[PDB]
């Protein structure tokens, strides 16, 4: 029969999801870039990035998120593969021995069901009590986060609503609750629920939001001071906290779809937003100290910040340093200013990272008639389109030509 042999020449470079936190130690911020199957563990330093341990896993890392459960100084990491094989990890260091230990695992797949249309969505509860998953288009898998799972137990609480667009956990409101963006057959809206782990069933949700924008795309839950939800759409930005509401449709967010977001400030004071054309925005929030203890929202601002590569990651690190991860080419690390430049951008370019991107065509070609060939790959996408030339070895080609064959040595003389 036919027998063949498969290796990896270039490790996969395009990134898929980026999570910050404290995964290595107690008091050290770090970055966890998953690309296709690799899980890179950097650390945030005063000069830039510094790798610690790269781990290749068996599967496409689809959903990852850090979480610190009540009882551990350090935190843990949940990773779900493309073949639905879930795991919970923990960094452990002892001298030169640096190891990753799986704390719980177990395949979580139903026998029957259409997978998805919006892909796989996974959200960690803010109080670290459960782990939600949208997997099979009509169910909401709940993994009860406890030490009881030597292998991961699972529930399947039925979503009565079929075509769910995005889903998050809302922040601290004494009970773990869920937000949606659901496409009705006639319209679309935002409904809520409340999971009872002891009864495996949805309780009554506190919000109604009977009609939101016709292309609402994501939910951004705002934290513990003035909790709520921001529903970014194609043409407008809303806010809801049960009673109050704001809405802006600024003329900046008109020409491109917001696709990524992160929480800049820990009290939700700022929010970056990227799009499908390269632009970074910043959704400012005006904190209104209305009463002696009341914290409410007052205004919604959108400030253009400049052009980067087409982002799919978006992570704010520290000291005004933002990491931009690009599937479509040239993931780069950027710096946000205070004042502006000649173009009004605050985005300072720093060191980049080479991505071979979506390769769409190749040709193996030699340009020095040698025994070694070069490979020109059509890399990148819309504005990140670039030919990339790939060679083995070390390219000493800027060399002086001196006719001295078989000489024994050349030694300096100075004054």
């Amino acid at each position: 029969m036919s027998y063949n042999y498969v290796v990896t020449a270039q490790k996969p470079t395009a990134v898929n999801g980026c999570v910050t936190g404290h995964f290595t130690s107690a008091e050290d911020l770090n970055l966890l870039i998953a690309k296709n199957t690799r899980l890179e563990i950097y650390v945030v330093t005063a000069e830039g990035l510094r790798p610690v341990k790269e781990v290749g896993m068996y599967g496409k890392i689809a959903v990852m998120e850090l979480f610190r459960p009540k009882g551990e100084s350090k935190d843990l990491l949940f990773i779900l593969t493309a073949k639905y094989n879930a795991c919970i990890l923990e960094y452990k260091q002892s001298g030169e021995s640096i190891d990753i230990i799986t704390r719980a695992h177990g395949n979580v797949q139903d026998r029957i069901g259409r997978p998805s249309e919006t892909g796989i969505i996974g959200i960690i509860d803010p109080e670290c009590r459960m782990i939600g998953l949208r997997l099979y288009d009509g169910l909401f898998k709940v993994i009860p986060l406890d030490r009881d799972n030597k292998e991961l137990k699972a529930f399947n609480i039925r979503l009565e609503e079929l075509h769910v667009i995005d889903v998050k956990f809302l922040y601290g409101c004494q009970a773990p609750t869920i937000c949606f963006v659901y496409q009705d057959p006639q319209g679309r809206h935002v409904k809520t629920y409340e999971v009872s782990l002891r009864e495996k069933e949805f309780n009554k949700g506190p919000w109604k939001q009977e009609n939101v924008e016709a292309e609402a795309s994501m939910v951004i839950a705002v934290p513990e001071p003035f909790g709520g939800a921001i529903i970014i759409g194609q043409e407008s930005i809303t806010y809801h906290n049960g009673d109050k509401y704001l809405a802006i449709a600024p003329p900046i967010i008109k020409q491109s779809t917001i696709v990524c977001h992160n929480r800049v400030d820990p009290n939700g004071s700022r929010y970056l937003l990227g799009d499908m054309e390269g632009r970074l925005f910043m959704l400012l929030l005006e904190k209104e100290e209305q009463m002696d203890g009341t914290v409410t929202l007052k205004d919604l601002r959108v400030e253009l910040l400049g052009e980067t590569s087409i982002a799919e990651c978006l992570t704010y690190l520290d000291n005004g340093v933002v990491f931009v991860g690009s599937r479509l080419g040239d993931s780069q690390l950027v710096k946000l200013n205070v004042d502006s430049n000649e173009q009004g951008s605050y985005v300072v370019a720093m060191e980049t990272f080479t991505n071979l991107g979506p390769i769409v065509d190749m040709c193996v070609v030699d340009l020095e008639r040698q025994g070694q060939g070069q490979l020109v790959t059509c890399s990148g996408a819309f504005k990140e389109g670039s030919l990339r030339i790939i060679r083995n070895g070390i390219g000493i080609h800027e060399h002086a030509s001196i006719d001295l064959p078989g000489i024994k040595g050349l030694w300096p003389l100075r004054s």
Binding site: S2, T8, L89, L387, G393, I394, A400
Partner: protein
């Protein structure tokens, strides 16, 4: 001192030095196989240089090369420095628009890149771009003419400038990589295939661009043309054109004839003397013929939904012929002929498989059915396949197929010998009990062929990236890999440590 280990360098005495290139204390191996010892993604793995033979080095002080060193040989003296040390040195030529395909001229020194520019439509003027890409900023430009799609009233007027696409043919310089020339096509004309070959006894070497006419709010297109270009003396020229009803998806050269693939129809051409084309034959049993690969006189077709398809060409009969066909509905992504018996294909379900032309042709039904020999979950979407190694031809395995994906993962697929298959596959099942993978995932479970309906366990292929990890395992655990096993040096021997690690290094030098 620790244990020793033999590394092959050559047949002459070698030199091992270190120096300061610009900084960071680089280490070099002056040998017949000259390597840089110092780093390979922060790991002690050798990586070569682009020099044939290095004997000595010399710390000079060049006025045009700061802190560089000269290299004494049995040949010339090269004052050179060393950049960031890695295996795969990558150089970026940005174009600021999406590249579609790439070809190569051997006679002329120029590439050929089809590309895609996003433009919005102006009210008074025609259109406008959004950024000064490397399409408009060229040394010369041109425009498509001879409006032969003028009778159709299909281009209706649009309301707003809602991001139409404009494609062109970038011809890029060989050494400077400056864009020499671009050629804008017709309005709403995509370009989907590019080959550059010679057709007939005409001693020119052309460009052939297979184009199609697209319209939104529409199904599959039925318009388009195939245009033959040439680049005589820095000037792109439109020689011929051939309006063809249907989108031209993939082209290959086939024995001095241009083979096409035009909306589930495989149409062979023939270059006449009068700068035109005459259709030689056709094939029709196709859902949507999206791919073509040839070797000699056989033709490999990758269908939209069905599979690998093998199609003959009998030149004495003047037509085609169906040799065989796989029946299992795999959604194709990329195909490539391996060795005129085995055929490799890619799938939307992120998988690989090899089909085989059958041997025991006891009837006509058992020889029109291709057999799937081998299944594997390369968990990554394969776009491209190509021949050609990346290492030096020193004149093992047989052949070398690289592939190009959507995450920048290049890998190598090559053909083994039937003895070393059972050698390595017995090593994997021993290695699948030693290395505890992160996540507690069985390697048999991950590499298993997984469509929407089949979960057959993986066979036929050797996952080399697990076997290359044997080099990192310590000897108190490598000894448990070396069980009571076999070794073929017709003869028979129990397995040992120092020879199984020699096998992997014979594989690691492929890549």
């Amino acid at each position: 001192l620790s244990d020793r280990k033999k590394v092959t360098l050559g047949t002459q005495p070698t030199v091992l030095r270190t120096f300061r290139s610009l900084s960071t204390t680089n280490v070099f191996a002056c040998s017949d196989r000259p390597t840089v010892i110092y780093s390979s993604n922060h790991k002690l793995v050798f990586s070569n240089v682009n020099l044939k033979e290095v004997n000595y080095m010399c710390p000079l002080n060049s006025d045009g090369y700061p802190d560089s060193l000269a290299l004494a040989n049995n040949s010339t003296l090269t004052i050179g420095t060393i950049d960031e040390i890695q295996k795969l040195h990558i150089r970026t030529v940005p174009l600021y628009e999406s590249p579609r395909k790439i070809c190569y001229q051997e006679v002329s020194q120029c590439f050929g890149v089809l590309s895609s520019r996003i433009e919005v439509q102006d009210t008074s003027g025609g259109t406008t771009a959004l950024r000064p890409s490397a399409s408009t900023q060229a040394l010369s430009s041109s425009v498509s003419s001879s409006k032969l799609f003028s009778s159709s009233t299909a281009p209706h007027e649009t309301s707003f400038g809602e991001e139409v696409e404009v494609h062109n043919l970038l011809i890029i310089d060989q050494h400077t990589f400056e864009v020499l020339h671009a050629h804008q096509f017709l309005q709403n004309e995509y370009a989907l295939s590019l080959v550059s070959c010679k057709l007939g006894k005409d001693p020119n070497t052309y460009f052939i661009v297979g184009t199609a006419m697209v319209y939104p709010e529409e199904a599959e297109p039925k318009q388009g043309r195939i245009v033959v270009f040439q680049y005589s003396d820095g000037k792109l020229q439109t020689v011929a054109e051939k309006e063809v009803k249907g989108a031209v998806y993939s082209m290959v050269e086939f024995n001095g004839k241009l083979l096409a693939s035009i909306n589930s129809t495989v149409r062979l051409y023939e270059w006449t003397t009068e700068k035109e084309l005459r259709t030689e034959c056709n094939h029709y049993n196709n859902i949507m013929a999206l791919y073509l690969k040839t070797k000699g006189d056989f033709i490999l077709v990758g269908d939209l939904m069905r599979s690998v398809l093998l199609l003959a060409y009998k030149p004495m009969e003047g037509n085609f012929e169906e040799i065989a066909r796989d029946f299992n509905p795999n959604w194709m992504s990329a195909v490539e002929i391996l060795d005129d018996d085995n055929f490799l294909g890619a799938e939307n379900a992120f998988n690989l498989f090899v089909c085989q032309k059958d041997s025991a042709a006891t009837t006509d039904e058992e020889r029109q059915h291709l057999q799937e020999v081998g299944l594997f979950h390369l968990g990554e979407f394969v776009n491209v396949f190509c021949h050609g190694s990346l290492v030096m031809q020193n004149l093992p395995t047989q052949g070398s197929v690289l592939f190009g994906t959507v995450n920048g993962m290049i890998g190598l697929v090559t053909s083994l010998s039937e003895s070393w298959y059972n050698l390595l596959l017995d090593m994997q099942n021993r290695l699948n009990k030693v290395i505890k993978s992160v996540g507690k995932i069985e390697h048999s479970f991950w590499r298993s062929f997984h469509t929407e309906r089949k979960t057959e366990p993986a066979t036929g292929f050797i996952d080399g990236d697990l076997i290359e990890s044997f080099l990192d395992i310590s000897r108190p655990k490598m000894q448990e890999v070396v069980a009571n096993l076999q070794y073929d040096d017709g003869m028979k021997r129990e397995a040992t440590a120092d020879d199984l690690i020699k096998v992997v290094e014979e594989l690691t030098r492929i890549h």
